[PDB]
Structures are given as C-alpha cells and as structure tokens.
Amino acid sequence: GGYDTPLGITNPPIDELLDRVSSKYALVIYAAKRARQINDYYNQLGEGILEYVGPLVEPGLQEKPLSIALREIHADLLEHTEG
Amino acid sequence: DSEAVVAVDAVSFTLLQDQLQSVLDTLSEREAGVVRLRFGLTDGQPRTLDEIGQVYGVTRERIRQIESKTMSKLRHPSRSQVLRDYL
Amino acid sequence: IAEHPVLLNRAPTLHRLGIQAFEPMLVEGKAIQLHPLVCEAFNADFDGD
Amino acid sequence: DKIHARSTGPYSMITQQPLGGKAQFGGQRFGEMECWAMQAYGAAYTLQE
Amino acid sequence: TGPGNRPLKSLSDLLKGKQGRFRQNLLGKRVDYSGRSVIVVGPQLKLHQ
DNA sequence: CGCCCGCTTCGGGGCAACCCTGCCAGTCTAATACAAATCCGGCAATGGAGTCAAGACCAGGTTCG
Numbered sequence: 001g002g003y004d005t006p007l008g009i010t011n012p013p014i015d016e017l018l019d020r021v022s023s024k025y026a027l028v029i030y031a032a033k034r035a036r037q038i039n040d041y042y043n044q045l046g047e048g049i050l051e052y053v054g055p056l057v058e059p060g061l062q063e064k065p066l067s068i069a070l071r072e073i074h075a076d077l078l079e080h081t082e083g
Numbered sequence: 084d085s086e087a088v089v090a091v092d093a094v095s096f097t098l099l100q101d102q103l104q105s106v107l108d109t110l111s112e113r114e115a116g117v118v119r120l121r122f123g124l125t126d127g128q129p130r131t132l133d134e135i136g137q138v139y140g141v142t143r144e145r146i147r148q149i150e151s152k153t154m155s156k157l158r159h160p161s162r163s164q165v166l167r168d169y170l
Numbered sequence: 171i172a173e174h175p176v177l178l179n180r181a182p183t184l185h186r187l188g189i190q191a192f193e194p195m196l197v198e199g200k201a202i203q204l205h206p207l208v209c210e211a212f213n214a215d216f217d218g219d
Numbered sequence: 220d221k222i223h224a225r226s227t228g229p230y231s232m233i234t235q236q237p238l239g240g241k242a243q244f245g246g247q248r249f250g251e252m253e254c255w256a257m258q259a260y261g262a263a264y265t266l267q268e
Numbered sequence: 269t270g271p272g273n274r275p276l277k278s279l280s281d282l283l284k285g286k287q288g289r290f291r292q293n294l295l296g297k298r299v300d301y302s303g304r305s306v307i308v309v310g311p312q313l314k315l316h317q
Numbered sequence: 318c319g320c321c322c323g324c325t326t327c328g329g330g331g332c333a334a335c336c337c338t339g340c341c342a343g344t345c346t347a348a349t350a351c352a353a354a355t356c357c358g359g360c361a362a363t364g365g366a367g368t369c370a371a372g373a374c375c376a377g378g379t380t381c382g
C-alpha cells in the first residue's frame with residue numbers, strides 16, 4: 001500500500017475494492033444496486049420517508065451516486081449475498 | 084421519418100401539463116373546475132356553458148361571467164411569467 | 171462531465187482491447203486527445219485516424 | 220468536416236434505428252465486432268443498453 | 269427485373285447475405301448518444317484520461 | 318442375348334470486412350354513347366350555443382349627521 005494519492009475515477013483503489021467481493025462482476029452489481037438505492041432515496045426525499053436509506057458516508061459537494069456507492073463499499077459499510 | 088416522436092417535446096408536454104396543473108390549482112375550486120370543464124382537461128370532450136351550469140346548479144350566464152372573470156385573472160404576469168416560455 | 175466515463179471506439183475492432191473507457195476532460199479545439207500508451211492496444215497512429 | 224455528435228435526431232422509416240452520416244444528424248455504427256468485444260469483456264448490461 | 273434492368277427485391281432477399289435483417293440490423297445497429305472525430309496525441313494526460 | 322453398377326465428369330449454390338460518403342431511373346389508331354355515381358354551390362329548415370343589457374339582491378368594508 002505504497003501508492004501515490006489517486007484522483008478522479010480511480011480514487012477508491014481497485015485492488016483494495018476487490019478484497020471485499022469474490023470477483024469483479026459481483027462488485028459491479030454491488031455498486032450498481034447501491035447506486036440505484038441511493039438515487040431512489042434522493043428522489044423520494046421530498047415526500048414521506050420510506051425504507052430506503054441515505055448515503056452513509058458524508059457526500060461531496062455535487063457527487064455522483066455511484067461514487068458514493070463505491071466509497072461506501074471501500075469503507076466496508078455494506079453487506080451482500082450472491083444468488 | 085417525420086411522423087415519429089421528437090422526444091423532447093413529449094417530455095416538455097408532460098412538464099407543461101404539470102405546470103398548468105400547478106397554475107390552475109393556485110386558484111379556487113369553482114374557477115379551476117369551470118375552466119377544466121370548459122376546455123376539456125379531465126375528459127376529451129369540453130363541456131359547454133349549459134353543461135357546466137347543469138353540473139353546477141346555476142344558469143349559463145353565471146358560468147359565462149365566471150369564465151370572463153377567470154380569463155381576466157389568468158392574464159396576470161404573476162400567472163403568466165412561468166407559462167410564457169411554453170409556446 | 172466530472173466523474174462520468176465514456177467509451178472510445180476505434181474501427182476496425184480486432185480484439186477485446188479495442189474498446190476502453192476513459193475519464194473525459196474538457197479540451198479546446200476539435201480533436202479527441204488520446205494518451206500515447208493506448209495507441210498500441212488501439213492499433214492507431216496519428217495519420218488521420 | 221469530421222467532428223460529429225448526436226443526442227437524439229431523426230430515425231429510419233421501416234426499421235426504427237437512428238439514421239447515418241454527418242449529412243443528416245445520424246449516429247455511429249455499433250457493429251458486430253464491437254458486440255464481440257463487449258461480450259468478451261463480460262460486460263452485458265452495456266450491451267443491453 | 270424492374271425499370272433499369274434491376275432485379276426486384278423479393279421476400280427472401282430481406283434476409284439473405286449481408287444486406288439482410290440479420291447481419292445488418294439485428295446484430296449491429298446505429299446508436300444514439302454517440303460521436304466521431306479525429307485523434308491527436310495528448311502526452312500530458314494521465315493514463316485513465 | 319440386353320441389363321445394370323462403380324468411376325468420372327459437369328454443374329449449381331455460397332461467400333468472399335470493417336469505419337465515413339452518399340440523396341429521384343421510361344412511352345403510341347382513337348374515339349362516341351350513355352349511365353351511374355359523386356360532388357359542389359346555394360338557399361332553407363332551424364336551433365343551440367354563445368353574447369349582451371339590465372336588473373334583483375346578500376351582505377360585508379367604507380364614510381357621514
């Protein structure tokens with residue numbers, strides 16, 4: 001873990017992400033379903049609150065939901081089961 | 084294929100319907116109901132003045148005066164500055 | 171634009187590395203600027219491709 | 220005479236695909252070999268898109 | 269043949285060969301949200317840009 | 318005795334890459350007669366839908382003796 005400080009797209013390092021899941025396809029569907037949950041939280045925020053849960057880590061200024069999903073994965077804050 | 088959907092005017096039509104719903108709901112109940120029945124918004128066929136006087140228990144002249152007063156109301160800039168860019 | 175990957179094709183696509191996804195950034199002019207290391211995988215020189 | 224882009228333009232007549240070439244608005248061709256590359260990645264959702 | 273001594277396009281000719289439905293419009297279609305331009309070398313970018 | 322099976326030759330069908338770029342192809346007996354169908358031009362029954370003028374009137378802000 002002696003890399004330089006990353007930036008942009010690859011800010012969570014992929015080799016630090018892939019120790020949480022089995023293979024990369026599971027990581028793809030992991031992050032995508034977390035991002036769908038987060039965007040459904042944002043759109044139903046103005047109405048009554050539902051079972052959808054917001055971004056756990058503190059978001060950026062105007063961040064994409066998928067980057068919030070990837071940082072929540074990298075912070076080891078979710079759990080998942082395959083099919 | 085010119086008979087297809089331009090796909091930006093359809094979503095603009097949807098937002099226009101929602102904006103017109105907000106503008107018509109900023110008024111009272113009798114005014115918005117008479118306007119929607121007059122111009123046929125909840126249904127396809129527009130109800131005439133006699134039909135709205137029948138459904139409102141009045142004569143058609145009161146319906147026509149209500150229509151004239153509401154059309155005088157709706158040309159205000161407070162109710163026009165959001166709908167001007169939709170034409 | 172920020173943090174939104176795009177795919178960059180090169181035709182003909184011979185093998186699996188003919189489509190790769192980059193992060194865009196705004197660049198003046200009218201030419202798609204490319205990294206000088208993916209030219210071997212893309213099999214693209216700059217003679218007007 | 221080469222730089223081109225499209226968000227949503229015209230469409231074809233019999234089939235309903237987008238049109239072709241810079242003369243019309245038109246979109247690029249995502250042919251057979253690029254579908255082979257997208258299959259060879261394992262990326263399936265982008266192919267469905 | 270029709271006018272100009274061209275053979276008419278029958279029903280089987282909508283499927284056969286390269287101009288059929290299969291190899292032309294089913295497997296590879298024109299897509300939307302696309303673009304095309306010429307490329308230049310961008311040696312100040314990082315690798316993923 | 319003509320009859321029929323292994324070889325050979327001949328022919329028919331398929332394919333032969335992938336990105337832009339494109340924008341429309343031809344001709345010789347000719348009439349009458351009639352009838353049915355369709356249309357179109359113009360008032361004539363309205364009659365309903367809307368327009369306007371006036372007024373009856375309920376009753377809460379607004380200003381005097």
Ligand SMILES: [Mg+2]
Nearest residue numbers: 215216217219
């Ligand atoms: Mg070249």
